[PDB]
Ligand binder design. Sequence first.
Ligand code: KLJ
Ligand code: CA
Ligand code: CA
Ligand code: CA
Ligand code: ZN
Ligand code: ZN
Length: 158
Amino acid sequence: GPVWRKHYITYRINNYTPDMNREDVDYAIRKAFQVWSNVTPLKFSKINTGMADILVVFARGAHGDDHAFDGKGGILAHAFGPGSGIGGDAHFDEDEFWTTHSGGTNLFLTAVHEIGHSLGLGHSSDPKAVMFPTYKYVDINTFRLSADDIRGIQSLYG
Ligand SMILES: COc1ccc(CCS(=O)(=O)NCC(=O)NO)cc1
Ligand SMILES: [Ca+2]
Ligand SMILES: [Ca+2]
Ligand SMILES: [Ca+2]
Ligand SMILES: [Zn+2]
Ligand SMILES: [Zn+2]
């Protein structure tokens, strides 16, 4: 499928969920990115202005693509694969309740999953993998990518 063909990649948080403190959304998204840079040659940067490769968006219902959101539960988030414009963009369902912990939907673990997509990974059938399609909360201090995840992204990059 598509990969990014360059090492320096940008992201930009477009708008912030009301559910969390600002610095907490910044930190969840930054930490999620680091999970992928730790196993690839890529370098990520947050830019606050203008066009970014990966636009991080909180939205609800119909929000301008063809992957309409479905109220609370169901579709937690989605993302598009590498490419320009909407390519790489990750959208988070604001009808969910975003958290740092386990009440509601953990933003950090969802963003790790979505960035997986943003970078060109499809889903894995391995339950152990972050790219498995079902959300399950684990203490984010204990989160590690499965060997499956590592084997997929290193197939794509580096
Ligand atoms: C292991 O951690 C996670 C695994 C999956 C999910 C998202 C599940 S989803 O939104 O309900 N399914 C849509 C989808 O695949 N969009 O990307 C979040 C975290
Ligand atoms: Ca939903
Ligand atoms: Ca984009
Ligand atoms: Ca919300
Ligand atoms: Zn969308
Ligand atoms: Zn997914």
